[PDB]
């Protein structure tokens with residue numbers, strides 16, 4: 001398939017900035033969510049999940065068609081817990097009905113990161129809603145109980161290399177696991193709602209113990225009360241991964257630059273942007289607009 005981006009008819013930057021502003025203001029306002037974590041984390045996860053079903057082999061899946069909106073994808077077990085991100089976005093959509101779904105879902109991840117103090121992520125509009133039959137089957141999202149080879153192999157399907165994988169994993173600093181959703185439980189550090197290189201620092205600095213949890217799954221638990229999934233821990237088991245983890249742990253800026261590029265790439269996978277398409281936008285945060 002070819003999925004050409006097509007700008008929402010007659011909309012420009014300022015139109016997008018408004019959807020952004022709306023998501024942002026609601027993030028501010030719904031700060032009680034998940035014990036005061038806020039909805040940031042879950043939106044980031046949502047944008048990753050709708051993008052992660054992509055398959056470089058046949059160009060199927062990916063963010064383009066907003067298929068997450070269909071039952072099949074919505075009900076994907078790997079998507080448990082995402083319905084909250086959805087519900088949060090719904091009223092926004094209602095307010096700006098001309099925005100396509102893939103555009104909205106993805107724009108929320110961007111807003112989330114930036115509002116949580118992360119780096120600015122350039123973003124492009126143009127995703128087009130596609131039919132229910134374009135919905136990818138379940139099983140395209142990664143499992144958490146594996147190792148580094150698994151992770152490397154998986155991400156290759158999305159054209160991400162080693163540096164991209166590690167950068168993107170740095171998002172694991174945010175939110176937490178929820179028993180009922182994934183069978184894992186616990187936060188991965190202390191500033192779980194601010195975007196920093198904490199993830200890397202925790203992986204290198206804590207004294208991790210392997211143990212089973214109440215869902216009878218294994219996780220790496222630290223004394224401070226943090227946890228790491230196997231796939232997370234595997235970043236220190238692989239030598240190639242580990243040197244990159246070290247770099248980010250030592251330089252937040254580098255990490256921010258690499259994340260930013262990787263995230264965009266991840267959200268733009270499988271989409272063709274015509275030469276005449278507008279450049280990527282860089283949205284101002286609420287704070288830069290004095291709002």
Ligand code: HEM
Pocket residue numbers: 041042044045048081142143144151168169171172174175176177178179180181182183184229231
């Ligand atoms: C090997 C790859 C990954 C796997 C196996 C993994 C698996 C998981 C699991 C099991 C959860 C917790 C679900 C819950 O019970 O609520 C989680 C949380 C989350 N994931 Fe990943 N994930 C992966 C990669 C990523 C990447 C690439 C991103 C974004 C770049 C992402 C961002 C997050 C976010 C921000 C959270 C927190 C969600 C919340 O607090 O609700 N993860 N991930």
